[PDB]
Amino acid sequence: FNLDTENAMTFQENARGFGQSVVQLQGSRVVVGAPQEIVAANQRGSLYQCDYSTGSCEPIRLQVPVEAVNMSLGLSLAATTSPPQLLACGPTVHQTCSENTYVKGLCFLFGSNLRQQPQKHEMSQEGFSAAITSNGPLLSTVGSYDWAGGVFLYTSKEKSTFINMTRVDSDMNDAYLGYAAAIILRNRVQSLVLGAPRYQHIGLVAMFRQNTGMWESNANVKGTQIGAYFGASLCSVDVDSNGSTDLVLIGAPHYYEQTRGGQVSVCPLPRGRARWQCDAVLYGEQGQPWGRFGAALTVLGDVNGDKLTDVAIGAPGEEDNRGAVYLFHGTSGSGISPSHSQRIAGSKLSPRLQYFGQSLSGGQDLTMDGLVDLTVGAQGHVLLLRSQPVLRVKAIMEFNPREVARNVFECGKEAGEVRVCLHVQKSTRDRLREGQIQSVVTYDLALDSGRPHSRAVFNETKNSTRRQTQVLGLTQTCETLKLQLPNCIEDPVSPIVLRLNFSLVGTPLSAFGNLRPVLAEDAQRLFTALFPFEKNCGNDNICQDDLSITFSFMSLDCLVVGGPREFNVTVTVRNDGEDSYRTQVTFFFPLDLSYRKVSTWRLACESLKSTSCSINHPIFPENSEVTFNITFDVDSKASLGNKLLLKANVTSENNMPRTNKTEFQLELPVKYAVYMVVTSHGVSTKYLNFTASENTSRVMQHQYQVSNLGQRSLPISLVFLVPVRLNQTVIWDRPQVTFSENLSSTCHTKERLPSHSDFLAELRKAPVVNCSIAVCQRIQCDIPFFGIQEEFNATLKGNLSFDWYIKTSHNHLLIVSTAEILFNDSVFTLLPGQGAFVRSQTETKVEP
Amino acid sequence: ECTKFKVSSCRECIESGPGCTWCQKLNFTGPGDPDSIRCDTRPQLLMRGCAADDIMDPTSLAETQEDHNGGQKQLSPQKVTLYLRPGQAAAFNVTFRRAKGYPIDLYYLMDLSYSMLDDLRNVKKLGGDLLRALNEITESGRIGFGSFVDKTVLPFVNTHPDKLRNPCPNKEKECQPPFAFRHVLKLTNNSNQFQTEVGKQLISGNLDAPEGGLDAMMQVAACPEEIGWRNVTRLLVFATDDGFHFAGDGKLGAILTPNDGRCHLEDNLYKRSNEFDYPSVGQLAHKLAENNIQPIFAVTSRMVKTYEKLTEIIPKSAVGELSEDSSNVVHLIKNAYNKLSSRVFLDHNALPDTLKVTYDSFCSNGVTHRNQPRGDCDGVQINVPITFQVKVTATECIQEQSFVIRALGFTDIVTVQVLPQCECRCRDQSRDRSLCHGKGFLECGICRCDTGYIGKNCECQTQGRSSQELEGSCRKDNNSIICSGLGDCVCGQCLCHTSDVPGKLIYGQYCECDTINCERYNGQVCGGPGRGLCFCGKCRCHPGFEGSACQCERTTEGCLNPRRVECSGRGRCRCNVCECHSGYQLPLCQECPGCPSPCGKYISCAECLKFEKGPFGKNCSAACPGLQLSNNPVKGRTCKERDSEGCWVAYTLEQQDGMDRYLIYVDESRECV
Ligand SMILES: *[C@@H]1O[C@H](CO)[C@@H](O[C@@H]2O[C@H](CO)[C@@H](O)[C@H](O)[C@H]2NC(C)=O)[C@H](O)[C@H]1NC(C)=O
Ligand SMILES: *[C@@H]1O[C@H](CO)[C@@H](O)[C@H](O)[C@H]1NC(C)=O
Ligand SMILES: *[C@@H]1O[C@H](CO)[C@@H](O)[C@H](O)[C@H]1NC(C)=O
Ligand SMILES: *[C@@H]1O[C@H](CO)[C@@H](O)[C@H](O)[C@H]1NC(C)=O
Ligand SMILES: *[C@@H]1O[C@H](CO)[C@@H](O)[C@H](O)[C@H]1NC(C)=O
Ligand SMILES: *[C@@H]1O[C@H](CO)[C@@H](O)[C@H](O)[C@H]1NC(C)=O
Ligand SMILES: *[C@@H]1O[C@H](CO)[C@@H](O)[C@H](O)[C@H]1NC(C)=O
Ligand SMILES: *[C@@H]1O[C@H](CO)[C@@H](O)[C@H](O)[C@H]1NC(C)=O
Ligand SMILES: *[C@@H]1O[C@H](CO)[C@@H](O)[C@H](O)[C@H]1NC(C)=O
Ligand SMILES: *[C@@H]1O[C@H](CO)[C@@H](O)[C@H](O)[C@H]1NC(C)=O
Ligand SMILES: [Ca+2]
Ligand SMILES: [Ca+2]
Ligand SMILES: [Ca+2]
Ligand SMILES: [Ca+2]
């Protein structure tokens, strides 16, 4: 598939540890670390900058300090392309002090020239993993605070800030936080993800955010199996390329199963205040125990040419430690596909490769062909798996005439004509010139594929099959080949069918180093075209029909996405004039819907996406009418917009023009289901005594706790009704609404008069004291964004006024305040039954 | 029921389903009936006219071979053979019996970190007790000793020349330099050798908080001859008070070569320890399994919960709370041995996915498990037979092959030979050839034809054209197209075409059924091969699935809370998903948000029960139906209201299974206004 191995460029070096870590640099340069090559006294580890043009590597003339380093330099590397920066760190600097030999990190930052560079809590190994932020390098200390972990973020060589978790009862000891690090972009604001492969013994990965200047850990996930070593490698993936991170990949290379070793998991970014959780797990091939799948992670950009970021994953333990590398595509649903697209095996490359796939680097083009290149590390070898351009073939079969003449088939020299057009296209964009890409394609044409004794044969082979090969450029090419019918046909019920299936072989590019094009793995390799016989439903005339379609969401007012999950529409199709052959109805509908069933004719159906239903193949009689219930399934997490536009139009083999009634569209309102519960809380002052000797001011509070238990974030308008005056005497003085969750909102107050004038008798009838016995104020608070699964304590506070107390027959009275959550009914709704809890009341009882 | 894809020969009926049967009588088929009628469900065959001697399923069966002279056979039969059938599982009863007198080999592998000083002090005077306690179970026991600290490299230990000489934190004390593994004592039945060789050991220490003993156990498994294992019960006591290093930790010490599991012992020391990483937990677990070595994780209280997780990876391993000074080693060993011997896991060696070996377990003490992935039983007594119903389903008509069933922890195995019973043993071949028009030959009542002839009785030659009178009979009614337009009539039967579109088989008597026309779930017909198959508008599910498209399971139900009741008694569940009434939420209906607190209206109930007041006019028992008072505090909603006497009743309302029933606990310290 896409990554090349037949002509893979290889670097050799007798340096010990060469190929342990690789990073790409702008242009055609790769920096490879050799963390065990000894070059001087107390000096191990040197950089090797490798060039595609020179075909070799020479050491970077670095001026290592003299402080008895043994840096193991090249064990960790980092780089950025704009501005040109590259970071090399030596995690293990053996500082032989008077009593102990501590291990610290030393860090080199380079610009466009690798000539001179700056070099600037023990046991920290400061440069174990490295990243370059938009303000400077980011260094990870796996050993800070008894191997708990942490990172240093650098704005300048003099100023840096330490980032880590809060300490809780030594649960984070030995976790190795910073064993991997990554950068996640949130609205182009820098944010951090860190991994702890040893956390407890199961592993942990966390997100760090810059919440109002400070760095805080908001979410984290944990591993399942002991010793699976969850969190060894991290890889932030921006699948959609919108400028914001979507997923974080967490590798567990030592996950143990009976026939598998190692796993990686997908953890999409949490939304709002929701908890961070995994949703998928990836695995290597079966029968490869201890494969260490997930030891290396990298971003390859868009490899297949579909604007979705793809990942490669290293498996250096496979096939007796000769290793493999796995390519996974990103999916359009902001996910990663559960199965690998390619496996590269060290055996197929060279017998000399050991630990193949221990290191990966991708993101830039080194071959200057315009395609991202992946560089892979091995013990003493480095290979350049150049991404091959992806070719897709579009085949157009156009029979001439469009239909088989009646006299040609009705009861061996009878003949026809077909034009086959093969058009090769690039899915990717690159710098290759026109005419450079040459491909060799071979294809097979089959007339009546799937049937014995085919009804037609080709002219140039005199049988029902033809194989042809040619060298094709990147442009439209066509060839016309005649057809023959060896016999008359007395059962013209089904067309002659032509099948085309092909295989494409790409010629190596001589200029760019024997690079070959590759046919896409998901490309349509089988093409079918129908050569229909002429109809005779008339006085030898051509067939025609007046087919029409109408449908309605009968007895349905609005479509609720959150329930019910299935809806069906009474589609009716009518035919007039003459019989219609092979009537198919295509339904075009938003991507979030899916098709389930068709009921009531031999009616069968197959699956903006489309769905074609076969209305009683092959024929649909005169003046006939058919009604059926096309049943759709609505996604629970769907987003169809304000209205959903179902569009269906009918087609027939007659190919009649598009009359206005052959197409029908009817928008229905979309009203998203929400489920909001408002309840009083026990801390509310539910009871009070009675006070009539003199008026008093006593504070009481009613907390109408609000929750969003659905799956939609919505704007809400929340209203309290609070008594303020009875019998020209105030019951409340100043009701002040308050929110404890600091969410953005504004509040105002309005006063309205009581609905009944019978406050002298209503108290006698019932002891209720609400806005029908007293003047009440209306506090309305507008919230523009109430998110998913978030709660806030809407509380009311103010001083009660005993200026109206009535000594009625009942020895108690009830002050009642009601809070109801208003929402835009044009878009949002509650579910039946459970929707009675949108409003709530709290009563403060006053009696002896 | 017997669902048949256009079957036309005897063995095809067996391939086509688990419940299908073939019949051999010649009268079973008329001129207008296709040979596929031979294959159907057994009662329909009996109804149509087949007989118990004319029918041939053929049932999957087993043969058991045993030795009469062999006494106290721990695992029988010695070997079995299975004439397996696709879909129809064979069953056979493997019997296990705990034997007496099997000796024990005990190897003691211990952490020598500084926190293990007192434990090492106690252990060095324990050899005789361990050997005698081994003899108290079975005679002729043996003991050993082994020691580990950690890799001799940073960060795991500091590499300063002074500290390498003396790594233990107390500078004054005399301690041995760090080492990965040292084999101390040969497996012997002499206590003097144990008390001598162990007594030369000295304490040590590393810098990191975990230790390396996973690579020590990996060497204790890799060196059989040096350790001295017999072909007997082998025990490996592992005594640690803290966590372990495992694979991946070596990158901090610039170590990246995997541990290879070979015997690297040289002069009783694991030299070359720094050129290999630590092993993974899967390396140790797998390697101990292929040598019948049973780990006994003697770990301290804080580490017990961590080490329990190893037992999910390592069967035939036990974990016990080790004291801070290893005083309870003998009792822990005996309890672990009893747990290991009573917990008889019975599992096979790996086999092709075409075999779905499954176990039913009729364990001893009244417990029974069904369709378990591996045999499971506990409390296996001595000389008390136990029965495991091994259920083996094929789906392939496999080629003659073999696998091994083994009682884990024991050398005894069961060889299983497996053979395709899909061939037919019909005796009809002795009939005269006149029935086949003198061209073919008759078996199972169907005239099988050679390459030159075709048809039910070989009447139609392959060269001759199809007769129109035969083609006209392949129609359901006057309006039906010939073979429904998806096939051709060959000697009176529709030869179906094949479709270039993926997965569309065409079949049925008149070539009228397609396997793609059933209604879809998640965009796939019947949920794809993983849920069911389509038979022209009807979906048949595999066991464990139901519904119109096999989208609904009938097993491993998510409806059931751990109390074994559907949706906590307050909701039906159609298709494995609970449906609720009122403001109750998915999935187990355990809690109701939004519904106001009912505490204020149950005051009429709490006023009576805890205080034992008489009837409130209406009787108290009828006043509070469906509620119980607990003699112990319960967890849930807390509430406080005012009673009829003006006193604060502070009580909690824990909801329990059913509709409108709770538990109430009321504070006795009543306070009144
Ligand atoms: C995260 O880092 C902070 C400091 O940035 C650590 O806080 C120190 O913890 C040690 C532990 O004994 C204390 O002695 C220090 O007094 C603490 N310093 C401050 C400023 O509070 C914290 O322990 C680290 N947590 C983890 C999990 O690594
Ligand atoms: C540095 O590395 C050399 C080469 O192995 C070694 O001999 C020397 O002891 C090391 N020095 C320190 C301080 O680790
Ligand atoms: C087309 O398909 C047939 C059957 O799968 C295959 O034999 C043939 O090689 C294919 N054609 C090409 C050009 O590969
Ligand atoms: C159509 O929808 C209704 C309402 O959900 C459902 O009861 C019915 O079974 C569906 N199918 C048909 C054929 O009516
Ligand atoms: C289609 O479904 C509606 C309700 O969804 C039902 O009233 C109607 O009878 C159904 N149509 C048929 C043909 O079953
Ligand atoms: C039917 O609708 C589709 C929707 O894109 C359109 O392309 C097509 O031209 C319409 N008419 C026919 C006859 O298919
Ligand atoms: C006020 O209280 C009365 C009596 O309980 C009740 O009927 C009414 O709905 C309440 N609200 C208003 C706005 O009157
Ligand atoms: C509301 O207040 C109560 C008591 O102060 C508290 O227990 C609860 O958590 C608060 N609500 C939220 C959403 O935090
Ligand atoms: C309400 O009472 C509180 C405390 O009794 C007092 O501080 C406050 O001034 C009073 N008035 C208002 C408007 O809050
Ligand atoms: C195995 O024994 C059980 C009784 O323990 C019995 O029910 C079962 O039928 C036996 N298995 C076979 C295949 O007979
Ligand atoms: Ca994004
Ligand atoms: Ca892609
Ligand atoms: Ca390139
Ligand atoms: Ca101790």
Shared domain check, A139 and A88: yes
> Cβ contacts of residue B267 below 8 Å, gap of 6+?
none
**Interchain contact, A147 vs B209, CB within 8 Å:** yes
* Residue among B250, B310, B241 at smallest CA distance from B282: B310
How far the first Cα of chain A sits from its last, in Å, is: 85
| Cβ under 8 Å to B: A residues 717-776 | none
Structural domains in chain A (count): 4
CB contact at 8 A, B150 and B277: no
State the SS3 of A421-461: EEEEEECCCCCCCCCCCCEEEEEEEEECCCCCCCCCEECCC
Shared domain check, A623 and A692: no
The rounded distance, in Å, linking the Cα atoms of A589 and A599 is 19
Residue A655 in tokens = 């190919």
Determine the atom of ligand 8 nearest the C-alpha atom of A707.
Answer: 13
A613 touches chain B (CB under 8 A): no
- Interface test with chain B among A72, A96, A226, A611, by most B beta carbons within 10 Å: A226
Count of other CB atoms within 10 angstroms of residue A832: 9
A238 labelled ligand-binding: yes
Q: Which residue of A has its CA nearest to B514?
A: A604
A616 touches chain B (CB under 8 A): no
The rounded distance, in Å, linking the Cα atoms of A676 and A811 is 36
Closest-CA distance, A53 to chain B, in angstroms, reads 31
Residue in the block written with tokens 């979705």: A308
Amino acid letter for position B332: L
Own/partner long-range contacts of A159-168 (Cβ < 8 Å, ≥24 apart)? A161/A215, A163/A192, A163/A208, A163/A215, A165/A206, A165/A217, A166/A217
> Cβ contacts of residue B271 below 8 Å, gap of 6+?
B264
* Sign of the alpha-carbon torsion through B487, B489, B494, B498: negative
A242 labelled ligand-binding: yes
Q: Is A304 left (phi over 0), alpha (psi -120 to 50) or beta?
A: alpha
Residue in the block written with tokens 């595999």: B542
Beta strands in A565-696 (DSSP E): 566-574, 580-581, 584-588, 593-597, 604-606, 612-614, 619-620, 625-634, 643-651, 663-669, 672-673, 676-679, 687-688
Phi, psi of B303 (to 5 degrees): -95, -5
The string of DSSP letters for A680-704 reads --TTS--EE----SS--EEEEEEEE
Compute the C-alpha angle A781/A787/A791, nearest 5°: 70
Shared domain check, A570 and A476: no
Experimental method: cryo-EM
Q: Is A116 in the pocket of ligand 3 (CB under 6 A)?
A: no
Q: Name the CA dihedral angle for B398, B399, B400, B404, rounded to a multiple of 10 degrees.
A: -50
The rounded distance, in Å, linking the Cα atoms of B13 and B399 is 18
Q: B78-99 burial string, b = 16+ CB within 10 Å, else e?
A: ebbbbbbbbbbbbebebebbbb
Determine the atom of ligand 7 nearest the C-alpha atom of A721.
Answer: 13
Nearest Cα residue to atom 13 of ligand 2: A94
Nearest Cα residue to atom 6 of ligand 9: A799
The rounded distance, in Å, linking the Cα atoms of B146 and B109 is 4
Radius of gyration of chain B (CA): 36
CA B111 to chain centre: 34
Chain B CB contacts of A200 below 8 Å = 306
Domain stops at, among A390, A417, A443 = A390
Residue A635 in tokens = 């996604």
Shared domain check, A194 and A45: yes
The rounded distance, in Å, linking the Cα atoms of A716 and A726 is 31
The rounded distance, in Å, linking the Cα atoms of B471 and B33 is 15
CB contact at 8 A, B439 and B450: yes
Shared domain check, A323 and A429: no
Q: Is A145 in the pocket of ligand 1 (CB under 6 A)?
A: yes
Choosing from A676, A678, A679, A681 the residue with most ligand 8 atoms within 8 A of its CB, the one to mutate for a pocket test is A681
Q: Which residue of A has its CA nearest to B639?
A: A682
Shared domain check, A549 and A460: no
SS3 B563: coil
The rounded distance, in Å, linking the Cα atoms of B639 and B649 is 8
SS3 A283: strand
Tell me the C-alpha to C-alpha distance, in Å, between residue B550 and each of A346, A594, B19, B525, B609.
43, 17, 19, 9, 51
Tell me the C-alpha to C-alpha distance, in Å, between residue A210 and each of A130, A163, A184, A279, B431.
19, 11, 12, 26, 90
A2 labelled ligand-binding: no
Antiparallel, parallel or unpaired: β B413-420 and B142-148: unpaired
Nearest Cα residue to atom 1 of ligand 9: A799
Antiparallel, parallel or unpaired: β B355-362 and A342-345: unpaired
Residue A6 in tokens = 């037949």
Ligand in nearest proximity to the CA of A706? 8
* Residue among A354, A366, A267 at smallest CA distance from A318: A354
The rounded distance, in Å, linking the Cα atoms of B486 and B483 is 6
The rounded distance, in Å, linking the Cα atoms of A314 and A325 is 5
Tell me the C-alpha to C-alpha distance, in Å, between residue A771 and each of A692, A801, A813, A842.
21, 16, 14, 14
Domain stops at, among A622, A639, A670 = A670
Residue A797 in tokens = 């506070």
Compute the C-alpha angle A448/A452/A454, nearest 5°: 40
Nearest Cα residue to atom 2 of ligand 6: A649
* Residue among A372, A457, A461 at smallest CA distance from A413: A457
* Residue among A492, A482, A425, A503 at smallest CA distance from A455: A492
| Inter-helix orientation angle B281-289/B301-313, to 10° | 60
Residue A684 in tokens = 């509310």
Residue A4 in tokens = 């090349």
CB contact at 8 A, B596 and A680: yes
Q: In what order do the strands lie in the sheet with B40-41?
A: B40-41, B20-23, B55-56
CB contact at 8 A, B359 and B372: yes
Helices (H) and strands (E) in chain B, counts: 14, 40
The rounded distance, in Å, linking the Cα atoms of A372 and A303 is 7
The string of DSSP letters for A159-201 reads -EEEE-PPP-TTTTTT--BTSEEEEEEETTEEEEEEEETTSTT
Antiparallel, parallel or unpaired: β A791-801 and A736-739: antiparallel
State the distance from the centre of ligand 2 to the C-alpha of A41, rounded, in angstroms: 8
CB contact at 8 A, A774 and A730: no
Compute the C-alpha angle B31/B34/B37, nearest 5°: 115
Residue in the block written with tokens 């096999």: B550
Residue B399 in tokens = 């080629």
Q: Is A361 in the pocket of ligand 2 (CB under 6 A)?
A: no
Breaks, C-N > 2.5 A, in chain B lie after none
* Sign of the alpha-carbon torsion through A332, A333, A339, A345: positive
**Which H or E run contains B329?**
helix B329-342
* Sign of the alpha-carbon torsion through A758, A763, A768, A773: positive
* Sign of the alpha-carbon torsion through B275, B280, B286, B289: positive
Shared domain check, A374 and A522: no
The rounded distance, in Å, linking the Cα atoms of B93 and B668 is 60
SS3 A496: strand
A709 touches chain B (CB under 8 A): yes
The rounded distance, in Å, linking the Cα atoms of B414 and B80 is 7
Query: Which residues, in sequence order, are bridge partners of residue A817?
Result: A842
Longest dimension (CA), chain A: 119
Ligand 4 contacts (CB < 6 A) are: A 566, 568, 599, 629, 631
SS3 A316: coil
Residue A615 in tokens = 């209305």
| Cβ under 8 Å to B: A residues 39-58 | none
> Cβ contacts of residue B212 below 8 Å, gap of 6+?
B148, B149, B150, B151, B156, B180, B181, B206, B244, B245, B278
The rounded distance, in Å, linking the Cα atoms of B51 and B22 is 11
A310 labelled ligand-binding: yes
The rounded distance, in Å, linking the Cα atoms of B109 and B96 is 32
Shared domain check, A3 and A124: yes
Compute the C-alpha angle B486/B492/B495, nearest 5°: 35
Tell me the C-alpha to C-alpha distance, in Å, between residue B389 and each of A204, B346, B366.
42, 11, 16
The string of DSSP letters for B79-141 reads EEEEEE-BSS-EEEEEEE-B-S---EEEEEEEE-SGGGHHHHHHHTT-HHHHHHHHHTTSSS-
CB contact at 8 A, A179 and A127: no
**Interchain contact, B313 vs A452, CB within 8 Å:** no
Determine the atom of ligand 3 nearest the C-alpha atom of A501.
Answer: 1
Nearest Cα residue to atom 12 of ligand 4: A629
Shared domain check, A471 and A360: no
A373 labelled ligand-binding: yes
Ligand in nearest proximity to the CA of A801? 9
Q: Is A734 in the pocket of ligand 9 (CB under 6 A)?
A: yes
Shared domain check, A835 and A795: yes
Q: Which of A197, A201, A289 sits opposite B282 (nearest CB)?
A: A289
Determine the atom of ligand 7 nearest the C-alpha atom of A772.
Answer: 14
Query: Quick one: chain A helix, strand, coil %, rounded to 5?
Result: 5, 50, 50
State the SS3 of A98-156: CCCEEEEEEEEEECCCCCCCCCCCCCCCCCCEEEECCCCEEEEECCHHHHCEEEEEECC
The residue count for chain A: 848
CA B68 to chain centre: 33
Domain stops at, among A523, A538, A553 = A538
Shared domain check, A157 and A112: yes
Q: Is A697 in the pocket of ligand 9 (CB under 6 A)?
A: yes
Helices (H) and strands (E) in chain A, counts: 5, 62
- Interface test with chain A among B153, B160, B595, by most A beta carbons within 10 Å: B160
Choosing from A64, A67, A94 the residue with most ligand 2 atoms within 8 A of its CB, the one to mutate for a pocket test is A94
Compute the C-alpha angle A774/A775/A781, nearest 5°: 125
Phi, psi of A6 (to 5 degrees): -65, -35
Residue in the block written with tokens 């007997």: B232
Choosing from A42, A43, A72, A96 the residue with most ligand 2 atoms within 8 A of its CB, the one to mutate for a pocket test is A42
Query: Which residues, in sequence order, are bridge partners of residue A203?
Result: A230
Chain B CB contacts of A317 below 8 Å = 258
Closest-CA distance, A606 to chain B, in angstroms, reads 7
SS3 A474: coil
Radius of gyration of chain A (CA): 36
Antiparallel, parallel or unpaired: β A687-688 and A839-846: parallel
The string of DSSP letters for A735-800 reads -EEEESS----EEEEEEE--S-S-HHHHHHH--EESTTTSEEEEEEEEEEEE-TT-EEEEEEEEEE
The rounded distance, in Å, linking the Cα atoms of B213 and B517 is 60
CB contact at 8 A, A111 and A84: yes
The rounded distance, in Å, linking the Cα atoms of B289 and A289 is 15
* Residue among B220, B227, B208 at smallest CA distance from B151: B208
**Interchain contact, A317 vs B258, CB within 8 Å:** yes
Q: Is A85 in the pocket of ligand 7 (CB under 6 A)?
A: no
Domain containing A499 equals: 391-538
A72 touches chain B (CB under 8 A): yes
The rounded distance, in Å, linking the Cα atoms of B145 and B109 is 6
CB contact at 8 A, A125 and A104: yes
CB contact at 8 A, A266 and A272: no
A568 touches chain B (CB under 8 A): no
The rounded distance, in Å, linking the Cα atoms of A31 and A88 is 9
Q: Is A823 left (phi over 0), alpha (psi -120 to 50) or beta?
A: beta
Q: Which of A143, A229, A680 sits opposite B155 (nearest CB)?
A: A143
Chain A CB contacts of B246 below 8 Å = 201, 227, 229, 254
Residue in the block written with tokens 């025609």: A544
**Interchain contact, B247 vs A35, CB within 8 Å:** no
Shared domain check, A463 and A577: no
